[PDB]
Design a protein around this nucleic acid. Structure first.
Ligand SMILES: [Mg+2]
Ligand SMILES: [Mg+2]
Ligand SMILES: [Mg+2]
Ligand SMILES: [Mg+2]
Ligand SMILES: [Mg+2]
Ligand SMILES: [Mg+2]
Lengths: 127, 98, 96, 79, 114, 151, 206
RNA sequence: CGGUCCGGCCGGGAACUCAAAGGAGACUGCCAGUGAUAAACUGGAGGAAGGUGGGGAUGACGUCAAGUCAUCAUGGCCCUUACGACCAGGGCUACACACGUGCUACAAUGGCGCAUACAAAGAGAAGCGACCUCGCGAGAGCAAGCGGACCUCAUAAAGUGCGUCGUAGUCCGGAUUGGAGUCUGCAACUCGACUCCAUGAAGUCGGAAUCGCUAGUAAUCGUGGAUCAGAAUGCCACGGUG
């Protein structure tokens, strides 16, 4: 069968599929390198496979929409680590100390009437 | 085959006068592809709250417009004759055609 | 907002349709690539107030021509003054 | 610089510009038609353009053609 | 390396050197070098004279340098001579094209003192 | 800071090294929220430096950074109609951060070409302590040890 | 001024909507004028009819309008007449056909609008404002009313300086969303000014 | 999974993303420490979320005879063949200046050229307007779909890859002016916005003084909307990187 695990981060939604095969990655029907596996998050995608050996052990096919570079990136990171419950909840405990388990609840702060943007306050006159 | 888009400003009223229809289908007729939600259109308006000056003022309003889909598959003279005249619940736009 | 200046807009809104959209239609095809007989952009000497771009848009209830809104046909004041009393269906103070 | 497909002038003024040919010129013509593009058929006239308070006399010249009458009728009395 | 106008420019890419002319912006300067079999960025360090005069004549077509400045100052003077509004503006050292004068008219007005 | 004391958030390590310090550095240099380019500028300078010293890579930074590193600074007091500006002992955590900021901010004021070149040339300049940055040391150490009577 | 409208704030919950139909951008406005035009004619014809609150829904190319009055008999009239005459006009105003109900007002001293309007007819009638507020509040807590406050202001009794004089009694938490709060306004056109009346009535919990 | 014109496109599938209704969940509750054995605070565990989790809405009695008779309403006062009313043209866009708020820059953390990867939120029938065609261009001709998770407004820009420039008043910067055009509008002189060609100020980091922001913020990059025939560097809103 398959081992699913959604996972998301800031407007981004990334679904991960885990099957035991090889250290290749099928993100949006293209290579890890064919997307952003070298940019401002070269390997935040590989991370979930740090203390949980890989190299060529298990293979994974991933889709993702919304957000931008590092957002989709982190999203996937999370989704992987969640689909990675497959082996057991025995590893999803030191994966915690890695922080990969936590949904980064940080969102774009809204703009607010009276301000130039979110927090930024229209400079006011001397006195 | 028979598709009805529902809309109104009260959610816990639209899905109610919707379940009226779904049940009134899977009682008489049959099939029906459930109550599909769809996306809500929220048109917001923001206006100044002071009659003179003060722009930091302002009040922010919105009008949420919720939808439902319906979609009944077996047009049975009995169910198609059930929808009609047993419609009620005003303040709900219903559309059957295209 | 000053009766007179109000009736003016009614006369304008009337003219807008007595003539324009009607006999004014003859300028769309009349005065564009259909080639010239000049009496074309000439007959454009009708009332004056006879034109949509000459209407203003006034708070349907007061007349205040500022702070207006297309959805409701009113200006921010009376719009809120009504919104806070039901009056405007579906409309309530939002947040997010 | 604007009009594209056909220059513009007011009718009343145009009439004042034709009538003032086969009946010879005369004193200043008075229009408020600061909106009109000058025609060659105006040259050697005396058309007086309203500028807010009054109508200034303007002598249609060899090549004041593609311009408007309002151009020669300053309105703000600066200084 | 004067060419068409007495200006003697070089030591950079051709497309860019050509811009010294008082009458060629990127566009003209494109239609120029691209109308000779010359390249975008070939310096003058390789461009033999006989490869330069095929240019000199390509630029001989459109008014530039002296003749241009003349033409323009002329048009302006024409404005003034009429007595319109753009004219009264050129003559009155103020912004022609409508810009506010209540403030910020410094380019057409000159640094302030009073 | 008036009531609710804290600590300080911490950051992922250097994506291309694994160090906290360096990442801190890139942030220090980053701007307009440009990480992609910032790090590209940092590594290139640490690279040209790297070879130009031959002296390893990791500690090419460490050494030159050990020169800017301060020991004492000054906190203004303004007590009674007088500024009475007292010297204080800088903590071993800020120290490094300041040195980093004087380096970055120094190369920033250099008249070279690439910010990478400017950087490297400041870095190596400090390796032989004679830069702007090191002078900032030979400045804050001047200010204290003078007001040092305010211990 | 720093108070949020106690009615409009509750709308989402615990409070209805005196206009409850649905329309699209296209004629939402043309409908709004109609709406706040028939209340215009209606609160004029039935002012002595102790009208508390008119309501409107537009059931598909048609309009309903339920009039909440405290003296329904007088609005209904002899065998339907008083509502009959209304049918017509209202229908020739909205542009469509029009039913028209008449919800009774169970105990009117609990209706903010009718309390206020009373306190107004009083001032116009030339009674001591203090007395009016007092009575209102009293014989309002008389029959339930977890809380209440009336506040009438401006040229009270007829001074050159303007006052506000309020009178709270019982419990009134404007800050609680889930609380039932009826609030209203009524202008008094006094023979020398215009005194503003506002009233809050607190009816309870969830 | 099955058909394949590599398109979720045809069955179909109802898992998943998502959509929107109803729910659960976090409470100092537990472990420990400090603390008067209390309140709390600190740290830890689990946990998507720890100590109001993030952001909103919500603004007490009152203060300044603060602001609004021009939104509306209204006591009083005043003109009423005029302070009312219709029309045309102009002015609200003036310019020796001074102040506030902002936009755009002085540049290689970039300018330019080509290729190219990832959003969010919204608007739309007197409307949004594909495609194709014509123009270097703004646009124009002909014309489908869509009253809208279907169609269109849109083709994100920072970014990333290569090539160029090598610190120059420059290949930055774009003011100002000349010439010629487009569109909306009865009409663009006063006074529209945009495009094509040329034109290239001041500016190389800003005295005294002074403002904003404590986390997905500041900084920075683009997107949409309201008013609107047609004038956004403003306003309201949206997400990128951080
Ligand atoms: Mg009036
Ligand atoms: Mg208009
Ligand atoms: Mg509260
Ligand atoms: Mg006051
Ligand atoms: Mg440039
Ligand atoms: Mg704070």
């Amino acid at each position: 069968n398959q081992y699913y695990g959604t996972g998301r981060r800031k407007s981004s939604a990334a679904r991960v599929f885990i099957k035991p095969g090889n250290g290749k990655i099928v993100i949006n029907q293209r290579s890890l390198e064919q997307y952003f596996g070298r940019e401002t998050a070269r390997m935040v995608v590989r991370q979930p496979l740090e203390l949980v050996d890989m190299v060529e052990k298990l293979d994974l096919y991933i889709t993702v929409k919304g957000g931008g570079i590092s957002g989709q990136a982190g999203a996937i990171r999370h989704g992987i680590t969640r689909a990675l419950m497959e082996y057991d909840e025995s590893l999803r405990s030191e994966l915690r100390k890695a922080g990969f388990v936590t949904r980064d609840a940080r969102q774009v702060e809204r703009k607010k009437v009276g301000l130039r943007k979110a927090r930024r306050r229209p400079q006011f006159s001397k006195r | 085959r028979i598709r009805i888009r529902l809309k109104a400003f009260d959610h816990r009223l639209i899905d109610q006068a919707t379940a009226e229809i779904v049940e009134t289908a899977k009682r008489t007729g049959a099939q029906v592809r459930g109550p599909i939600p769809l996306p809500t259109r929220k048109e917001r308006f923001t206006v100044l709250i002071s009659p003179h000056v003060n722009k930091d003022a302002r009040d922010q309003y919105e009008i949420r417009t919720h939808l439902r889909l319906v979609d009944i598959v077996e047009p049975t003279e009995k169910t198609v004759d059930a929808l009609m005249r047993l419609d009620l619940a005003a303040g709900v736009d219903v559309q059957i055609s295209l | 907002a000053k009766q007179s200046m109000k009736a003016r807009e009614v006369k304008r809104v009337a003219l807008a349709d007595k003539y324009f959209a009607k006999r004014a239609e003859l300028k769309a095809i009349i005065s564009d690539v259909n080639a010239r007989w000049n009496a074309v952009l000439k007959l454009q000497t009708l009332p004056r107030d006879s034109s949509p771009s000459r209407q203003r848009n006034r708070c349907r209830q007061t007349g205040r021509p500022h702070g207006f809104l297309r959805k409701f046909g009113l200006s921010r004041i009376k719009v809120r003054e009504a919104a806070m009393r039901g009056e405007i269906p579906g409309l309530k103070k939002a947040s997010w | 610089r604007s009009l594209k497909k056909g220059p513009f002038i007011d009718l009343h003024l145009l009439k004042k510009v034709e009538k003032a040919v086969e009946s010879g010129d005369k004193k200043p013509l008075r229009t408020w038609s600061r909106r009109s593009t000058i025609f060659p058929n105006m040259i050697g006239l005396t058309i007086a353009v309203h500028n807010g308070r009054q109508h200034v006399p303007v002598f249609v010249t060899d090549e004041m053609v593609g311009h408007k009458l309002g151009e020669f009728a300053p309105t703000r009395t600066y200084r | 390396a004067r060419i068409a106008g007495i200006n003697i420019p070089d030591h950079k890419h051709a497309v860019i050197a050509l811009t010294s002319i008082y009458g060629v912006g990127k566009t003209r300067s494109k239609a120029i070098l691209a109308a000779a079999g010359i390249a975008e960025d070939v310096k003058i360090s390789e461009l033999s004279e006989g490869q330069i005069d095929t240019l000199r004549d390509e630029v001989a077509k459109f008014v530039v340098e002296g003749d241009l400045r003349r033409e323009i100052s002329m048009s302006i003077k024409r404005l003034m001579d009429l007595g319109c509004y753009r004219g009264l503006r050129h003559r009155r050292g103020l912004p022609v094209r409508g810009q506010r004068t209540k403030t910020n008219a410094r380019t057409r007005k000159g640094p302030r003192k009073p | 800071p008036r009531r609710r004391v804290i600590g300080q958030r911490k950051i992922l390590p250097d994506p291309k090294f694994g160090s906290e310090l360096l990442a801190k550095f890139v942030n220090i240099l980053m701007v307009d929220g440009k990480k992609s380019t910032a790090e590209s500028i940092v590594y290139s300078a640490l690279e040209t430096l790297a070879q130009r010293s031959g002296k390893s890579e990791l500690e090419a930074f460490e050494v030159a950074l050990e020169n800017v590193r301060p020991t004492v600074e000054v906190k203004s007091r303004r007590v009674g109609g007088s500024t009475y500006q007292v010297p204080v002992e800088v903590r071993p955590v800020r120290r490094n951060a300041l040195a980093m900021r004087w380096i970055v901010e120094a190369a920033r004021k250099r008249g070279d070409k690439s910010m990478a070149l400017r950087l490297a040339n400041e870095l190596s300049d400090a390796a032989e302590n004679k830069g702007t940055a090191v002078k900032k040391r030979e400045d804050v150490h001047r200010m204290a040890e003078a007001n040092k009577a305010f211990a | 001024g720093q108070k949020v409208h106690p009615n409009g704030i509750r709308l989402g919950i615990v409070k209805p909507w005196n206009s409850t139909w649905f329309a699209n951008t296209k004629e939402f406005a043309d409908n709004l004028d109609s709406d706040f035009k028939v209340r215009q004619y209606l609160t004029k014809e039935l002012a002595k009819a102790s009208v508390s609150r008119i309501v409107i829904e537009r059931p598909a190319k048609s309009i309903r309008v339920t009039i909440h009055t405290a003296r329904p008999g007088i609005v209904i009239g002899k065998k339907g007449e008083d509502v009959e005459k209304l049918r017509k006009v209202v229908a020739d105003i909205a542009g469509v056909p029009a039913q028209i109900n008449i919800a009774e007002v169970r105990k009117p001293e609990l209706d903010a609008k009718l309390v206020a309007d009373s306190i107004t007819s009083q001032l116009e009638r030339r009674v001591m404002f203090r007395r009016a507020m007092k009575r209102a509040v009293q014989n309002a807590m008389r029959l339930g009313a977890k809380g209440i406050k009336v506040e009438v202001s401006g040229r009270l009794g007829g001074a050159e300086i303007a006052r506000t004089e309020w009178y709270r009694e019982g419990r009134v938490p404007l800050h609680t969303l889930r609380a039932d709060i009826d609030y209203n306004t009524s202008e008094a056109h006094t023979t020398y000014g215009v005194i503003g009346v506002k009233v809050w009535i607190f009816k309870g919990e969830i």
